[PDB]
Amino acid sequence: TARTDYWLQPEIIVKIITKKLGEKYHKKKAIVKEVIDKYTAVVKMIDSGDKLKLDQTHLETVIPAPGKRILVLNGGYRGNEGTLESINEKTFSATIVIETGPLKGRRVEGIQYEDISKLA
């Protein structure tokens, strides 16, 4: 179905949420350069440029400012790009406008943070 347990895509910004590869990287952002076998990212840290391989469980999507572009990673809108309109922190969700495909222009409320990420 459109719902998968794996979510990484290349060319998105993620936040490293583990200390396991060194405290240097904890809470720091990176670009996903490649996805290997669904669950693993090869990331390049934005600040240092260091390369790491990390499971999805050690990464978090990055929700950008209003007006900025996201990729939909999961659920029925997956594969489309969108514009982040607003967030609802309480429900870990966002409102986006779909920017691609047949539903371009649709305003989608309540898309989970986990299902979208800032495009690099």
Swiss-Prot record:
One GO term (biological process): DNA repair
Chain positions covered by the region annotation C-terminal subdomain A: 11-61
Swiss-Prot/TrEMBL keywords: Coiled coil, Cytoplasm, DNA damage, DNA recombination, DNA repair, DNA replication, DNA-binding, Host-virus interaction, Metal-binding, Methylation, mRNA processing, Nucleus, RNA-binding, Stress response, Zinc, Zinc-finger
Protein name: DNA/RNA-binding protein KIN17
Bilayer-crossing regions: none
Domain notes: The C-terminal domain (268-393) is organized into 2 subdomains that bear structural similarities to SH3-like domains. Both subdomains adopt a similar 5-stranded beta-barrel-like fold and are connected to each other by a short linker of 5 residues. The 5 beta-sheets are packed at approximately right angles against each other. A highly conserved groove formed at the interface between the 2 subdomains, comprised of Lys residues 302 and 391 and other positively charged residues, may possibly be the site of RNA-binding.
Similarity section: Belongs to the KIN17 family.
Domain of life: Eukaryota
Cellular component GO terms, alphabetical: cytosol; nuclear matrix; nucleoplasm; nucleus; protein-containing complex
Disulfide bonds: none
Note: Recognized by antibodies directed against the RecA protein.
Function: Involved in DNA replication and the cellular response to DNA damage. May participate in DNA replication factories and create a bridge between DNA replication and repair mediated by high molecular weight complexes. May play a role in illegitimate recombination and regulation of gene expression. May participate in mRNA processing. Binds, in vitro, to double-stranded DNA. Also shown to bind preferentially to curved DNA in vitro and in vivo. Binds via its C-terminal domain to RNA in vitro.
Region (C-terminal subdomain B): 67-118
